[PDB]
Write a structure and sequence with these properties.
part of a larger assembly, 6 chains, A mainly alpha (93), B mainly alpha (113), C mainly beta (64), D alpha+beta (274), E alpha+beta (348), F alpha+beta (93), C: 64 residues, mainly beta, 4-stranded antiparallel sheet, 0% helix, E: 348 residues, alpha+beta, 3-stranded antiparallel sheet, 10 strands, elongated, binds magnesium ion, RNA-binding, Large ribosomal subunit protein bL31m (chain F), structural constituent of ribosome (chain F), ribonucleoprotein (chain F), mitochondrion (chain F)
RNA sequence: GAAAGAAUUAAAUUAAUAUAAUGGUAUAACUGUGCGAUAAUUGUAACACAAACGAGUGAAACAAGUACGUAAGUAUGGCA
RNA sequence: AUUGAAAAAAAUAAUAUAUAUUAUAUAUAUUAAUUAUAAAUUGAAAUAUGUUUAAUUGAAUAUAUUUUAGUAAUAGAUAAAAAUAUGUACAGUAAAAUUGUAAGGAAAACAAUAAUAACUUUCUC
């Protein structure tokens, strides 16, 4: 809500193939237009963002897929295994 | 007026600057404000409790160590001496890494050296 | 001559006037002081004309 | 002005008058910056800090265990010595300065559950010396710093004047940024994992590096900064790049303790220790 | 769930507004805030996301804490400790916070902010310390009303004065104000708000308005003047406005004589002091005290000596200050005081 | 001689009205050399990165555990260890 | 037992003071910051210091107006 | 006030309106704004009106009407880099030397370098 506008003009150069994709991914804010009632106040826009609200910015070549935090050992409840709890401190008894 | 380098510098400056990039102020209703206060205060209390728990635990550990070392001194002087050495250049092992967000492909290495 | 003398004439048209010194190319010196004829604080302004070191008017409106 | 004589009058009550509160001038400023009603509000505790959590869980107990010396008493530092009153000229005399040093040194306490060493602050001093010619280089350096940290940099200016190095006084030259809390922790984690392994012949931080009291430092070349993921992702946008000094400030009594702490966070140490 | 219970706990800890309470405690962020009165403004407004579930969790946490505190509070016997426990239990209650913050503390309605309740009293004290007390202290020190009359003050009660009977207008006097002779022609009204735990039934109070700056030409200095003197006044945390209604003619040790500053005599400080009585043990009911009415004089009045005699402790103070104007002669005439002196403009 | 950007009149931030610089930051997933993913907040717009050279594949951080490419490509039929042993007489130096 | 605050003690006037040198200055007279840009204003100035005269210096107070300050108050150019 | 969502009210402060008093008070209503300001044959966005695709909404594209982009530093009552040298209000403390750190070296920048007894608040055994 309090975050700044994303300065897209810096990270994406004007008239470039990379910028175009980013633009397509994004959706713009509703501008103020004369002779119309905006019952959620008049749009306050600068660098293409509604100042009155939170901004959302949607974004080898491979998707980064993280591994499951629960394990096979955990599922089986194998007490002798070391991979059975990954978020806790295990002690040898 | 300005060179391309000058332009790029200006752009860079803008990235850092608060000029026409920041939203409206976060205004709240009085009820909302109260709710926020209660959220924050409770959280702070919880954090304090956690700190005390950890601090208490540390104190307990210290006491246990003290108890041990006195006993060692009483019984076996050589063992006590061995225990109480300067550990000036003691280095944590490079395998004890800072726990990541998600685990690796190979969770644990059974062979070494 | 580095510092010249000038005559500041009261804006409330009493005829009262106060004299002060300034640097040769200093900005136009207007000051609010007591005019005893009128019995109040009024603006004083330079009666004579003179050249000034022309400063560039700093632009708050972001140009170009 | 009738006089310059400064002389605060005594009072007849023990109530502490906060003068700021009695005014009606700065109503937004009466609120604390932590308070939501202040324009200075920022969400502090946004997510769980990982390095800090690790320190809390594993390291802190280990560090305490390491630093236990049995019946260790306080080691007083070098202080200002008083005069022996063996002459009437000692009577309102200022004390003799410390033995070796001109400035006084702090007392070294035994490590207990309260005063275990931990990370206090990181400072990233980048003074670009080509910016004596080009002011724009300072700006670029500041941006780079901001990118690296996610924290607002502060501009460094030339405090001194010197002819040999073509350096004026009062000229903007690079930037600095004091990281604290979670951002600092993140920056350390990035340094440990991403950047320092990509440095080719990197042995580690020197064991001869540091303050006398709980402060360790090192520096990165312009070659090393291109490994930061924010800089690396747009090498077209970053043609020039500037080195930096990295002052790590710990809550350690002595420097070996600080080194040990940093090692706990996966910082390698190579040289012969003092 | 201790904070929903009102069997043993007072009614004041709840919010009296129903809509506000409903808004506070809902299962989703569906409703709109009662504070925003206007429809369009409500429509415009958007509260921060996820606030409800977290708030509920925080409430549960602090409610549990309060309940735990209460477990100790009832076992406790000594009164100050019990009060402190009660405060600890309820201070983090959202409802009591709402009540205190957003409704008047000066003229508190009993159902909303009850100063009989310990938590609310503590809150009021804290509020006083934050601003009003500091201001009062500053005005006492700067104007030199402390050492000139009465050595020190340890502010305990918040004292506010008013002059309702003279003019007609309603205004609580800010400490160190310049009031006209018309304004201060008839007597003032005090409100002594007490924040410490005190025996309401037994504890009596005295109120003395003193004028240190009336000129004595024999001494070539000034003398004090007791302009208004009340004794043996009964206060209650909520019922605390000292008015001709409350105090009787027996309580008036020196009935109100108005500020009538002389021309060129200067600005005259009128610093009201509020003392609490000495409390005697093994005696049920309010312990009165007799004042020797021939002994104490109004034209010259050792305040410190008086305090020493009757064993008083100054808990509160307030101050205004009057100087000569056209209507002081009229005031004198009304009261039947003499014409009034006129001094030289120069302090030679 | 000295290259500069000449300053405009500074904008007066009033006391109390100063707001903290909350820069626009994305939650970015870093997959390290091995499959261990870690989330970090970052100013550059990229939801996922995978790293090649990290601490998790550097020998210093774990002691216990395209010219070259071109060369490999165009000397592939020969298959270039045995080759080292053949061409390494250590008499002459 | 811990965290935070209020701070206190010690040291310092060796830096800094538009400018010489001396005295003073952290209770800051030094430094930062808001407002301001007014008091680098108008008539009477006693009384002192200094003092051959001519001059010089500090200045209470009275009156008119102004600026800052919640107030107390401070400002009749500059630490001298 | 109309619109969205699913009898009222009880602070401070600000704003609007009214009146009380040789008292810058009170009453009722409401909680705005908060880092902006002219000038862009070229970038980006919205809405409206058309046409084509799978009465419909998405998607594509044309015109019109707007909105944004002039990208520029202080974000802190800033505190010994440089800059407004006289007023006032609020607040703070310098320097040297030492130990270090990428180019950096005697000499550029940044960090660190006296003591917590008692007191208040908070959490806790
Ligand atoms: Mg000077
Ligand atoms: Mg000197
Ligand atoms: Mg003489
Ligand atoms: Mg003479
Ligand atoms: Mg001065």
């Amino acid at each position: 809500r309090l975050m700044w506008t994303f300065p897209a003009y810096f990270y994406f150069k004007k008239g470039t193939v990379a910028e175009h994709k980013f633009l397509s991914l994004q959706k713009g804010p509703i501008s103020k237009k004369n002779g119309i009632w905006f019952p959620r106040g008049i749009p306050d826009i600068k660098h293409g963002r509604e100042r009155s609200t939170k901004q959302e910015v949607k974004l080898v070549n491979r998707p980064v897929i993280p591994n499951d935090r629960i394990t096979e050992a955990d599922r089986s409840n194998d007490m002798k295994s070391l991979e059975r709890q990954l978020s806790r401190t295990l002690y040898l008894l | 007026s300005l060179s391309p380098l000058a332009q790029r510098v200006v752009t860079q400056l803008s990235v850092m600057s608060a000029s026409r990039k920041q939203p409206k102020l976060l205004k709240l209703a009085r009820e909302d404000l109260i709710k926020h206060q209660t959220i924050e205060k409770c959280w702070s209390i919880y954090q304090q409790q956690q700190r005390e728990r950890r601090n208490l635990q540390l104190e307990l550990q210290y006491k246990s160590i003290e108890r041990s070392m006195n006993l060692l001194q009483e019984l076996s002087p050589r063992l006590f001496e061995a225990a109480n050495a300067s550990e000036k250049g003691k280095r944590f092992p490079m395998e004890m890494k800072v726990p990541t967000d998600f685990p690796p492909n190979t969770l644990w290495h059974y062979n070494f050296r | 001559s580095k510092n010249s003398v000038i005559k500041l004439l009261s804006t409330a048209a009493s005829g009262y006037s106060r004299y002060i010194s300034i640097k040769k190319g200093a900005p136009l010196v207007t000051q609010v002081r007591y005019d005893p004829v009128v019995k109040r604080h009024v603006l004083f302004k330079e009666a004579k004309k003179r050249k000034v070191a022309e400063r560039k008017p700093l632009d708050f409106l972001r140009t170009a | 002005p009738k006089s310059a004589c400064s002389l605060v009058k005594p009072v007849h009550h023990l109530v502490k008058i906060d003068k700021s509160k009695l005014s009606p001038r700065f109503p937004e400023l009466k609120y604390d910056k932590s308070d939501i009603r202040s324009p200075g509000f920022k969400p502090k505790d946004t997510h769980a800090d990982r390095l800090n959590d690790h320190y809390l869980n594993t390291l802190q107990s280990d560090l305490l265990l390491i630093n236990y010396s049995h019946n260790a008493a306080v080691v007083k530092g070098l202080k200002q010595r008083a005069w022996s009153g063996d002459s009437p000229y000692h009577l309102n005399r200022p004390p003799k300065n410390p033995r070796g040093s001109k400035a006084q040194l702090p007392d070294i306490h035994p490590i207990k559950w309260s005063n275990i060493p931990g990370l206090e602050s990181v400072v990233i001093n980048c003074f670009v010396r080509e910016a004596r010619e080009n002011q724009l280089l300072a700006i670029t350096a500041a941006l780079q710093l901001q990118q690296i940290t996610g924290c607002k940099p502060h501009p460094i200016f030339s405090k001194n004047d010197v002819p040999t190095w073509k350096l004026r006084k009062g000229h903007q030259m690079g930037a600095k940024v004091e990281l604290k809390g979670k951002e600092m922790s993140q920056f350390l984690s990035t340094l440990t994992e991403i950047v320092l392994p990509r440095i080719r012949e990197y042995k580690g931080i020197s064991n001869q590096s540091g303050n006398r009291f709980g402060g360790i430092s090192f520096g990165l070349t312009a070659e090393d900064i291109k490994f930061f993921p924010e800089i690396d992702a747009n090498q077209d946008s970053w043609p020039k790049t500037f080195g930096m000094h990295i002052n790590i400030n710990t809550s350690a009594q002595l420097d070996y303790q600080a080194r040990t702490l940093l090692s706990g966070f996966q910082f390698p140490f190579f040289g012969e220790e003092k | 769930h201790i904070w929903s219970d009102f069997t043993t706990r007072p009614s004041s800890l709840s919010i009296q507004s129903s809509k506000v309470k409903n808004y506070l405690f809902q299962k989703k962020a569906s409703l709109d805030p009662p504070s925003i009165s206007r429809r369009s403004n409500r429509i415009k407004y958007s509260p921060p996301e996820h606030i409800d579930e977290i708030f509920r969790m925080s409430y549960d946490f602090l409610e549990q804490r309060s309940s735990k505190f209460y477990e100790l509070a009832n076992k406790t016997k000594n009164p100050l400790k019990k009060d402190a426990l009660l405060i600890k239990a309820e201070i983090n209650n959202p409802e009591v916070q709402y009540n205190f913050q957003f409704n008047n503390k000066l003229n508190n309605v009993k159902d909303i902010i009850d100063y009989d309740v310990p938590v609310y009293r503590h809150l009021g004290k804290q509020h006083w310390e934050s601003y009003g007390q500091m201001l009062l202290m500053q005005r006492l020190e700067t104007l030199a009303a402390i050492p000139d009359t009465l050595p020190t003050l340890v502010p305990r009660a918040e004292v506010n004065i008013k002059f309702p009977f003279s003019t007609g207008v309603n205004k609580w006097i800010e400490p160190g104000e310049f009031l006209s002779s018309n304004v201060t022609s008839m007597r003032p009204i005090f409100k002594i708000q007490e924040y410490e735990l005190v025996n309401v039934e037994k504890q009596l109070y005295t109120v003395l308005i003193v004028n240190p700056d009336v000129p004595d030409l024999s001494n070539d200095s000034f003398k004090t003047a007791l302009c208004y003197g009340l004794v043996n006044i009964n206060l209650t945390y909520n019922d605390n406005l000292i008015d001709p209604r409350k105090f009787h003619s027996s309580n008036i040790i020196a009935d109100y004589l108005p500020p009538v500053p002389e021309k060129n005599a200067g600005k005259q400080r009128f610093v009201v002091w509020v003392f609490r009585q000495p409390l005697i043990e093994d005696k049920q009911g309010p312990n009165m005290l007799e004042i020797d009415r021939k002994e104490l004089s109004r034209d010259d009045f050792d305040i410190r000596q008086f305090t020493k005699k009757y064993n008083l402790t100054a808990i509160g103070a307030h101050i205004w200050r009057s100087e000569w104007d056209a209507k002081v002669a009229a005031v004198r005439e009304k009261y039947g005081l003499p014409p009034g002196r006129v001094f030289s403009r120069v302090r030679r | 001689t000295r290259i500069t950007l000449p300053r405009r009149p500074a904008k007066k931030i009033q006391l109390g009205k100063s707001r903290p610089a909350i820069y626009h930051q994305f939650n970015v997933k870093m997959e390290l050399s091995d499959g261990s993913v870690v989330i970090r907040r970052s100013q550059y717009p990229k939801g996922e990165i995978r790293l090649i050279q990290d601490q998790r594949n550097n020998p210093l951080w774990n002691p216990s555990r395209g010219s070259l490419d071109r060369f490999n490509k165009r000397y592939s039929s020969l298959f270039s260890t045995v080759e080292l042993s053949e061409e390494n007489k250590k008499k002459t130096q």
